[PDB]
mmCIF file of C-alpha atoms and ligand atoms in Angstrom:
data_model
loop_
_atom_site.group_PDB
_atom_site.id
_atom_site.type_symbol
_atom_site.label_atom_id
_atom_site.label_comp_id
_atom_site.label_asym_id
_atom_site.label_seq_id
_atom_site.Cartn_x
_atom_site.Cartn_y
_atom_site.Cartn_z
ATOM 1 C CA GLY A 1 38.070 -59.228 11.938
ATOM 2 C CA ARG A 2 34.622 -58.271 10.594
ATOM 3 C CA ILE A 3 33.422 -55.060 8.871
ATOM 4 C CA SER A 4 29.756 -54.028 9.249
ATOM 5 C CA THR A 5 27.816 -53.411 6.002
ATOM 6 C CA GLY A 6 25.838 -50.651 7.794
ATOM 7 C CA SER A 7 22.784 -52.967 7.941
ATOM 8 C CA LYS A 8 22.162 -55.005 11.142
ATOM 9 C CA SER A 9 20.003 -57.469 9.103
ATOM 10 C CA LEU A 10 22.701 -58.112 6.438
ATOM 11 C CA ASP A 11 25.401 -58.277 9.176
ATOM 12 C CA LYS A 12 23.385 -61.024 10.945
ATOM 13 C CA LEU A 13 23.169 -63.019 7.661
ATOM 14 C CA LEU A 14 26.987 -62.588 7.242
ATOM 15 C CA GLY A 15 27.780 -63.611 10.860
ATOM 16 C CA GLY A 16 28.733 -60.048 11.915
ATOM 17 C CA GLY A 17 29.950 -58.559 8.605
ATOM 18 C CA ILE A 18 32.565 -59.287 5.915
ATOM 19 C CA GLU A 19 35.654 -61.157 7.168
ATOM 20 C CA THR A 20 39.358 -60.300 6.882
ATOM 21 C CA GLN A 21 41.611 -63.033 5.340
ATOM 22 C CA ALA A 22 38.647 -63.797 3.029
ATOM 23 C CA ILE A 23 37.125 -62.790 -0.339
ATOM 24 C CA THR A 24 33.432 -61.816 -0.123
ATOM 25 C CA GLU A 25 31.791 -61.720 -3.587
ATOM 26 C CA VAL A 26 28.449 -59.890 -4.052
ATOM 27 C CA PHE A 27 26.682 -60.664 -7.346
ATOM 28 C CA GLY A 28 23.424 -59.342 -8.758
ATOM 29 C CA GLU A 29 21.868 -57.498 -11.712
ATOM 30 C CA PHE A 30 22.548 -53.803 -12.451
ATOM 31 C CA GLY A 31 20.852 -51.647 -9.761
ATOM 32 C CA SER A 32 20.996 -54.324 -6.989
ATOM 33 C CA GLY A 33 23.235 -52.219 -4.638
ATOM 34 C CA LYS A 34 26.718 -53.771 -5.211
ATOM 35 C CA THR A 35 28.545 -50.401 -5.655
ATOM 36 C CA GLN A 36 26.552 -48.740 -2.818
ATOM 37 C CA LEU A 37 27.566 -51.602 -0.454
ATOM 38 C CA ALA A 38 31.234 -51.134 -1.523
ATOM 39 C CA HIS A 39 31.041 -47.358 -0.804
ATOM 40 C CA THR A 40 29.456 -48.015 2.635
ATOM 41 C CA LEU A 41 32.146 -50.603 3.603
ATOM 42 C CA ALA A 42 34.858 -48.055 2.605
ATOM 43 C CA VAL A 43 33.496 -45.774 5.394
ATOM 44 C CA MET A 44 32.528 -48.471 7.981
ATOM 45 C CA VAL A 45 36.042 -50.072 8.018
ATOM 46 C CA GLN A 46 37.395 -46.754 9.435
ATOM 47 C CA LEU A 47 35.256 -46.997 12.627
ATOM 48 C CA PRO A 48 36.388 -48.778 15.842
ATOM 49 C CA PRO A 49 35.224 -52.439 16.268
ATOM 50 C CA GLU A 50 32.488 -51.379 18.772
ATOM 51 C CA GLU A 51 30.990 -49.331 15.872
ATOM 52 C CA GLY A 52 31.431 -52.015 13.147
ATOM 53 C CA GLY A 53 34.905 -51.154 11.803
ATOM 54 C CA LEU A 54 38.570 -52.195 12.149
ATOM 55 C CA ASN A 55 40.199 -48.752 12.713
ATOM 56 C CA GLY A 56 41.509 -49.085 9.156
ATOM 57 C CA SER A 57 41.871 -47.585 5.678
ATOM 58 C CA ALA A 58 40.143 -48.736 2.470
ATOM 59 C CA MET A 59 41.438 -49.382 -1.061
ATOM 60 C CA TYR A 60 38.947 -49.189 -3.981
ATOM 61 C CA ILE A 61 39.698 -50.472 -7.527
ATOM 62 C CA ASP A 62 36.931 -49.193 -9.878
ATOM 63 C CA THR A 63 36.506 -50.902 -13.293
ATOM 64 C CA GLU A 64 33.095 -49.351 -14.166
ATOM 65 C CA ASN A 65 33.713 -45.589 -13.593
ATOM 66 C CA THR A 66 31.186 -45.567 -10.683
ATOM 67 C CA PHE A 67 33.397 -44.494 -7.724
ATOM 68 C CA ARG A 68 31.985 -41.280 -6.153
ATOM 69 C CA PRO A 69 33.988 -39.413 -3.444
ATOM 70 C CA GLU A 70 30.922 -37.150 -2.885
ATOM 71 C CA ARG A 71 28.937 -40.304 -1.905
ATOM 72 C CA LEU A 72 31.606 -41.180 0.726
ATOM 73 C CA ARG A 73 31.277 -37.569 2.011
ATOM 74 C CA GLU A 74 27.462 -37.943 2.300
ATOM 75 C CA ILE A 75 27.706 -41.366 4.052
ATOM 76 C CA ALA A 76 30.335 -39.925 6.464
ATOM 77 C CA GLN A 77 28.280 -36.769 7.250
ATOM 78 C CA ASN A 78 25.060 -38.792 7.817
ATOM 79 C CA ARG A 79 26.966 -41.131 10.218
ATOM 80 C CA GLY A 80 28.458 -38.210 12.235
ATOM 81 C CA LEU A 81 32.013 -38.610 10.828
ATOM 82 C CA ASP A 82 34.364 -35.909 9.465
ATOM 83 C CA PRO A 83 34.018 -36.245 5.641
ATOM 84 C CA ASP A 84 37.533 -34.871 4.880
ATOM 85 C CA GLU A 85 39.133 -37.467 7.226
ATOM 86 C CA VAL A 86 37.047 -40.312 5.671
ATOM 87 C CA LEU A 87 38.151 -39.329 2.108
ATOM 88 C CA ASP A 88 41.829 -39.194 3.236
ATOM 89 C CA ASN A 89 41.507 -42.845 4.423
ATOM 90 C CA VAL A 90 40.245 -44.213 1.057
ATOM 91 C CA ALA A 91 42.719 -44.865 -1.787
ATOM 92 C CA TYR A 92 40.987 -45.291 -5.177
ATOM 93 C CA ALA A 93 42.175 -46.232 -8.695
ATOM 94 C CA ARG A 94 40.258 -46.604 -11.959
ATOM 95 C CA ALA A 95 41.291 -49.748 -13.877
ATOM 96 C CA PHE A 96 40.893 -49.168 -17.655
ATOM 97 C CA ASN A 97 41.499 -52.845 -18.657
ATOM 98 C CA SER A 98 42.226 -56.325 -17.160
ATOM 99 C CA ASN A 99 46.046 -55.870 -17.412
ATOM 100 C CA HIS A 100 45.788 -52.557 -15.474
ATOM 101 C CA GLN A 101 43.468 -54.205 -12.881
ATOM 102 C CA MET A 102 46.157 -56.834 -12.096
ATOM 103 C CA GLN A 103 49.022 -54.257 -12.163
ATOM 104 C CA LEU A 104 47.147 -52.155 -9.543
ATOM 105 C CA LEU A 105 47.371 -55.135 -7.099
ATOM 106 C CA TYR A 106 51.205 -54.799 -7.109
ATOM 107 C CA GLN A 107 50.896 -51.064 -6.322
ATOM 108 C CA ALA A 108 48.253 -51.956 -3.693
ATOM 109 C CA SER A 109 50.655 -54.442 -2.013
ATOM 110 C CA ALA A 110 53.388 -51.738 -1.817
ATOM 111 C CA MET A 111 50.915 -49.266 -0.215
ATOM 112 C CA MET A 112 49.733 -51.999 2.221
ATOM 113 C CA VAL A 113 53.303 -52.769 3.477
ATOM 114 C CA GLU A 114 53.921 -49.029 4.069
ATOM 115 C CA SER A 115 50.629 -48.647 6.013
ATOM 116 C CA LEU A 116 51.586 -51.484 8.438
ATOM 117 C CA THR A 117 50.842 -46.973 11.163
ATOM 118 C CA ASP A 118 47.716 -46.430 13.351
ATOM 119 C CA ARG A 119 45.404 -46.905 10.319
ATOM 120 C CA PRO A 120 46.601 -49.865 8.187
ATOM 121 C CA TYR A 121 44.585 -50.914 5.122
ATOM 122 C CA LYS A 122 41.899 -53.394 6.274
ATOM 123 C CA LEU A 123 39.682 -53.458 3.144
ATOM 124 C CA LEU A 124 40.330 -53.928 -0.603
ATOM 125 C CA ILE A 125 37.351 -53.470 -2.978
ATOM 126 C CA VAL A 126 37.303 -54.585 -6.656
ATOM 127 C CA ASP A 127 34.121 -53.214 -8.319
ATOM 128 C CA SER A 128 33.842 -55.128 -10.556
ATOM 129 C CA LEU A 129 35.916 -58.354 -10.631
ATOM 130 C CA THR A 130 34.779 -59.441 -14.130
ATOM 131 C CA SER A 131 33.578 -56.426 -16.224
ATOM 132 C CA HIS A 132 36.884 -56.090 -18.179
ATOM 133 C CA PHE A 133 37.218 -59.878 -18.716
ATOM 134 C CA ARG A 134 33.657 -59.995 -20.156
ATOM 135 C CA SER A 135 34.302 -57.060 -22.554
ATOM 136 C CA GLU A 136 37.785 -58.276 -23.657
ATOM 137 C CA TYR A 137 36.567 -61.828 -24.553
ATOM 138 C CA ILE A 138 33.367 -60.960 -26.488
ATOM 139 C CA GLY A 139 33.163 -63.525 -29.335
ATOM 140 C CA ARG A 140 35.924 -65.553 -27.601
ATOM 141 C CA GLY A 141 34.096 -66.895 -24.496
ATOM 142 C CA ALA A 142 35.497 -70.435 -24.918
ATOM 143 C CA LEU A 143 39.154 -69.258 -24.634
ATOM 144 C CA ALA A 144 40.881 -70.770 -21.548
ATOM 145 C CA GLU A 145 42.915 -67.511 -21.204
ATOM 146 C CA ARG A 146 39.904 -65.611 -19.749
ATOM 147 C CA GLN A 147 39.418 -68.154 -16.903
ATOM 148 C CA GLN A 148 43.213 -68.427 -16.371
ATOM 149 C CA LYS A 149 43.584 -64.625 -16.030
ATOM 150 C CA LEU A 150 40.659 -64.480 -13.546
ATOM 151 C CA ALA A 151 42.186 -67.394 -11.571
ATOM 152 C CA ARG A 152 45.531 -65.506 -11.318
ATOM 153 C CA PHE A 153 43.711 -62.331 -10.152
ATOM 154 C CA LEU A 154 41.770 -64.232 -7.430
ATOM 155 C CA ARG A 155 44.984 -66.019 -6.301
ATOM 156 C CA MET A 156 46.650 -62.596 -5.796
ATOM 157 C CA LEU A 157 43.559 -61.272 -3.915
ATOM 158 C CA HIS A 158 43.681 -64.293 -1.519
ATOM 159 C CA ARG A 159 47.432 -63.682 -0.979
ATOM 160 C CA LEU A 160 46.782 -59.993 -0.080
ATOM 161 C CA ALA A 161 43.847 -60.893 2.233
ATOM 162 C CA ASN A 162 46.052 -63.373 4.170
ATOM 163 C CA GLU A 163 49.388 -61.436 4.202
ATOM 164 C CA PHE A 164 47.871 -58.100 5.335
ATOM 165 C CA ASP A 165 44.853 -59.425 7.348
ATOM 166 C CA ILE A 166 42.470 -57.488 5.043
ATOM 167 C CA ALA A 167 38.882 -58.134 3.934
ATOM 168 C CA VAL A 168 38.642 -58.406 0.120
ATOM 169 C CA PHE A 169 35.208 -57.375 -1.252
ATOM 170 C CA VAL A 170 34.497 -57.975 -4.977
ATOM 171 C CA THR A 171 31.392 -57.374 -7.119
ATOM 172 C CA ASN A 172 30.169 -59.465 -10.081
ATOM 173 C CA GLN A 173 27.283 -58.784 -12.530
ATOM 174 C CA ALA A 174 35.139 -66.508 -3.292
ATOM 175 C CA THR A 175 35.322 -67.475 0.396
ATOM 176 C CA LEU A 176 31.683 -66.257 0.533
ATOM 177 C CA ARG A 177 29.146 -65.533 -2.261
ATOM 178 C CA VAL A 178 26.150 -63.191 -1.629
ATOM 179 C CA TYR A 179 23.328 -62.621 -4.182
ATOM 180 C CA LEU A 180 21.523 -59.226 -4.164
ATOM 181 C CA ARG A 181 18.122 -58.747 -5.824
ATOM 182 C CA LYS A 182 14.909 -56.681 -5.834
ATOM 183 C CA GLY A 183 11.600 -58.130 -4.634
ATOM 184 C CA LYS A 184 8.032 -56.832 -4.231
ATOM 185 C CA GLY A 185 7.805 -53.044 -3.697
ATOM 186 C CA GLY A 186 11.497 -52.566 -4.539
ATOM 187 C CA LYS A 187 12.490 -54.481 -1.385
ATOM 188 C CA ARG A 188 16.269 -55.121 -1.598
ATOM 189 C CA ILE A 189 17.106 -58.714 -0.595
ATOM 190 C CA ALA A 190 20.430 -60.490 0.064
ATOM 191 C CA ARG A 191 20.945 -64.296 0.321
ATOM 192 C CA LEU A 192 24.059 -66.545 0.619
ATOM 193 C CA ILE A 193 25.021 -68.836 -2.319
ATOM 194 C CA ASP A 194 26.726 -72.290 -2.041
ATOM 195 C CA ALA A 195 27.437 -71.614 1.623
ATOM 196 C CA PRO A 196 26.752 -74.878 3.501
ATOM 197 C CA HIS A 197 26.328 -74.566 7.311
ATOM 198 C CA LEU A 198 25.691 -70.791 6.895
ATOM 199 C CA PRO A 199 22.246 -69.020 7.125
ATOM 200 C CA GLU A 200 19.948 -70.132 4.250
ATOM 201 C CA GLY A 201 17.488 -67.244 4.682
ATOM 202 C CA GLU A 202 17.277 -63.775 3.123
ATOM 203 C CA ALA A 203 18.057 -60.341 4.625
ATOM 204 C CA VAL A 204 16.220 -57.104 3.655
ATOM 205 C CA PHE A 205 18.347 -53.931 3.453
ATOM 206 C CA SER A 206 17.901 -50.307 2.317
ATOM 207 C CA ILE A 207 20.065 -47.745 0.440
ATOM 208 C CA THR A 208 19.747 -44.274 2.043
ATOM 209 C CA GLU A 209 21.744 -41.069 2.768
ATOM 210 C CA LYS A 210 23.780 -43.228 5.245
ATOM 211 C CA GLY A 211 24.568 -45.775 2.504
ATOM 212 C CA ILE A 212 23.461 -49.343 3.330
ATOM 213 C CA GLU A 213 21.250 -49.560 6.457
ATOM 214 C CA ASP A 214 18.106 -51.337 7.733
ATOM 215 C CA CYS B 1 51.578 -44.430 -14.619
ATOM 216 C CA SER B 2 47.875 -44.629 -13.642
ATOM 217 C CA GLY B 3 47.775 -45.588 -9.945
ATOM 218 C CA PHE B 4 45.898 -44.645 -6.770
ATOM 219 C CA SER B 5 44.782 -41.298 -5.311
ATOM 220 C CA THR B 6 43.071 -40.405 -2.017
ATOM 221 C CA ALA B 7 39.301 -39.924 -2.523
ATOM 222 C CA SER B 8 40.103 -36.214 -1.749
ATOM 223 C CA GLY B 9 42.121 -36.080 -5.031
ATOM 224 C CA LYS B 10 45.751 -36.436 -3.829
ATOM 225 C CA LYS B 11 47.854 -38.717 -6.086
ATOM 226 C CA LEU B 12 49.449 -41.554 -4.045
ATOM 227 C CA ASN B 13 52.844 -42.513 -5.508
ATOM 228 C CA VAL B 14 54.757 -45.834 -5.293
ATOM 229 C CA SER B 15 58.524 -45.669 -6.023
ATOM 230 C CA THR B 16 59.954 -47.799 -8.871
ATOM 231 C CA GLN B 17 61.923 -49.703 -6.166
ATOM 232 C CA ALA B 18 58.842 -50.306 -3.933
ATOM 233 C CA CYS B 19 56.927 -51.412 -7.061
ATOM 234 C CA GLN B 20 59.681 -53.889 -8.035
ATOM 235 C CA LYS B 21 59.796 -55.304 -4.459
ATOM 236 C CA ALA B 22 56.012 -55.977 -4.523
ATOM 237 C CA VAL B 23 56.242 -57.650 -7.967
ATOM 238 C CA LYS B 24 59.192 -59.780 -6.711
ATOM 239 C CA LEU B 25 57.325 -60.806 -3.517
ATOM 240 C CA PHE B 26 54.012 -61.653 -5.269
ATOM 241 C CA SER B 27 54.726 -62.428 -8.994
ATOM 242 C CA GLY B 28 56.372 -65.825 -8.333
HETATM 243 N N1 LIG C 301 23.426 -40.999 -2.791
HETATM 244 C C1 LIG C 301 22.468 -41.917 -2.868
HETATM 245 N N2 LIG C 301 21.468 -41.891 -1.957
HETATM 246 C C2 LIG C 301 20.506 -42.817 -2.040
HETATM 247 N N3 LIG C 301 20.366 -43.811 -2.914
HETATM 248 C C3 LIG C 301 21.370 -43.814 -3.803
HETATM 249 C C4 LIG C 301 22.429 -42.929 -3.846
HETATM 250 N N4 LIG C 301 23.274 -43.239 -4.901
HETATM 251 C C5 LIG C 301 22.724 -44.284 -5.462
HETATM 252 N N5 LIG C 301 21.569 -44.690 -4.844
HETATM 253 C C6 LIG C 301 20.715 -45.797 -5.251
HETATM 254 O O1 LIG C 301 21.501 -46.948 -5.430
HETATM 255 C C7 LIG C 301 20.868 -47.814 -6.408
HETATM 256 C C8 LIG C 301 21.928 -48.340 -7.344
HETATM 257 O O2 LIG C 301 22.840 -49.155 -6.575
HETATM 258 P P1 LIG C 301 24.262 -49.596 -7.165
HETATM 259 O O3 LIG C 301 25.143 -50.000 -6.030
HETATM 260 O O4 LIG C 301 24.763 -48.560 -8.116
HETATM 261 O O5 LIG C 301 23.878 -50.911 -7.994
HETATM 262 P P2 LIG C 301 24.812 -51.927 -8.827
HETATM 263 O O6 LIG C 301 26.235 -51.517 -8.537
HETATM 264 O O7 LIG C 301 24.473 -53.306 -8.322
HETATM 265 O O8 LIG C 301 24.427 -51.720 -10.271
HETATM 266 C C9 LIG C 301 19.745 -46.984 -7.049
HETATM 267 O O9 LIG C 301 18.474 -47.364 -6.542
HETATM 268 C C10 LIG C 301 20.082 -45.556 -6.616
HETATM 269 O O10 LIG C 301 18.953 -44.713 -6.545
HETATM 270 C C1 LIG C 302 53.216 -46.673 -12.716
HETATM 271 C C2 LIG C 302 52.251 -47.784 -12.347
HETATM 272 C C3 LIG C 302 52.843 -49.175 -12.394
HETATM 273 C C4 LIG C 302 52.765 -50.032 -11.312
HETATM 274 C C5 LIG C 302 53.385 -51.264 -11.416
HETATM 275 C C6 LIG C 302 53.527 -52.199 -10.241
HETATM 276 C C7 LIG C 302 54.303 -51.559 -8.988
HETATM 277 N N1 LIG C 302 54.014 -51.649 -12.535
HETATM 278 C C8 LIG C 302 54.045 -50.756 -13.550
HETATM 279 N N2 LIG C 302 54.730 -51.099 -14.653
HETATM 280 N N3 LIG C 302 53.477 -49.527 -13.525
HETATM 281 MG MG1 LIG C 303 27.790 -50.917 -9.700
#
């Protein structure tokens, strides 16, 4: 299954949108649109496939204190959706450290089994995948433990994507890596990284009251 | 216990038993 990003241009670069049974990783500097894309996907996944969704629910793990329910309400209202229904279909959790981030995947798996209902979870967002690891290993970047912990976290994410047929979307400041940046005139640009046999070009997108869109 | 809530603010709970089952299925 594929979830639309809200932007026809970015969807075309991604082959239709982000895939289930896969980890899509968006990386870029602060202000590049990573969190806004996550918020938009959390609404789009709820739509029927003809409208870019998978008739599903979204799970959002926030490690940077940047999750905004009022933004989901605005995206829903500006796409003609009931905002209260959209908020009821998004489960969110703040992760305060890397241990908590991993523990929340066990709770996520329990919620996913229970939802297997007319609106199963189809999207898991981790925004961001590495913020806690970077802060916890300041002055200790050479320690193998940091890479080993991240490897265990990614292994669990792949297991969830495959067992529940869910798209995993992670941000970084990977089945598929996407780089976001700003060009001339504040143009927002996305391109694929280390993706042989996939589009090599760039896609321009915008951030508006509807979230991500052309 | 810091876990998940709906974006509307409703705490979503996972039983100790359901938690243990998930850890058992995915920890090994
Ligand atoms: N409700 C909104 N409506 C329009 N633009 C918004 C809204 N909220 C945030 N933005 C824009 O999103 C951009 C920041 O994107 P964000 O996803 O937070 O970046 P990153 O997570 O990569 O640091 C800013 O240009 C900001 O003005
Ligand atoms: C109370 C939150 C929580 C979740 C999990 C995994 C199900 N383990 C622990 N110890 N605590
Ligand atoms: Mg962000």
